[PDB]
């Protein structure tokens, strides 16, 4: 956007030397084929277990029986005979 | 013993010392220690890894 001089006008690029025209136009690589080598493993010896883990511990428990229940010899109150 | 100890006036490019004494320095021992740096536990999905 500049603005044109009319005292001091100018022309268009004129010729100049050049690269060397072949010299500025690359060659198009040439891909062979390739392979991802060796026959892979199906698993790994892993560091870390794969599954989750808990963050807290709950007790568990299991029912127990008791025994068998025997019978008593109680100590017997006195007879209500108007004093009681 | 030959490539790590040049001369006063030799080239000391891959040498190692330089001096008026290089004709008898070497080696008493060199120890080498290879660590690999890997990633374990790769991700496998299906179609492999």
């Known amino acids: 956007?500049?603005?044109?001089?009319?005292?001091?006008?100018?022309?268009?690029?004129?010729?100049?030397?050049?690269?060397?025209?072949?010299?500025?136009?690359?060659?198009?690589?040439?891909?062979?084929?390739?392979?991802?080598?060796?026959?892979?493993?199906?698993?790994?010896?892993?560091?870390?277990?794969?599954?989750?883990?808990?963050?807290?511990?709950?007790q568990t428990y299991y029912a127990i029986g008791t025994g068998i229940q025997?019978?008593?010899t109680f100590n017997q109150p006195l007879i209500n005979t108007q004093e009681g | 013993n030959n490539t790590a100890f040049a001369a006063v006036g030799a080239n000391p490019l891959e040498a190692i010392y330089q001096g008026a004494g290089a004709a008898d320095c070497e080696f008493e021992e060199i120890s080498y220690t290879v660590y690999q740096s890997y990633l374990d536990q790769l991700p496998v999905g299906q179609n492999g890894y």
């Open chain 1, 70 to 72: 025997m019978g008593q």
């Open chain 1, 1 to 58: 956007m500049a603005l044109i001089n009319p005292q001091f006008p100018y022309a268009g690029p004129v010729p100049i030397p050049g690269p060397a025209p072949t010299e500025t136009m690359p060659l198009l690589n040439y891909r062979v084929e390739g392979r991802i080598a060796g026959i892979q493993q199906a698993r790994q010896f892993m560091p870390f277990l794969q599954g989750p883990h808990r963050e807290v511990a709950e």
